[PDB]
């Protein structure tokens, strides 16, 4: 299943993509992608549009 991240970073912007197998993986996959990009805001995941975002 594919999941899309939305970043809206003071440091960092753009958008990402990972597939998954559900949302409980694509959640600790992006987040892991933010985290490992130093990113740290607040975070959010819509089921209906597979898309989760992140906003420092």
Same mark, same amino acid.
């Given at each position: 299943?594919?999941? =899309?991240?939305?970043? !809206?970073?003071?440091?960092?912007? @753009? %958008?990402? #993509? ?12 992006? =987040?892991?992608?933010? !985290?490992?990009?130093?990113?740290? @805001? %607040?975070? #959010? ?12």
């Amino acid at each position: 299943m594919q999941y =899309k991240l939305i970043l !809206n970073g003071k440091t960092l912007k @753009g %958008e990402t #993509t990972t597939e998954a197998v559900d949302a409980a993986t694509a959640e600790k996959v992006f =987040k892991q992608y933010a !985290n490992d990009n130093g990113v740290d @805001g %607040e975070w #959010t995941y819509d089921d209906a549009t597979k898309t989760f975002t992140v906003t420092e």
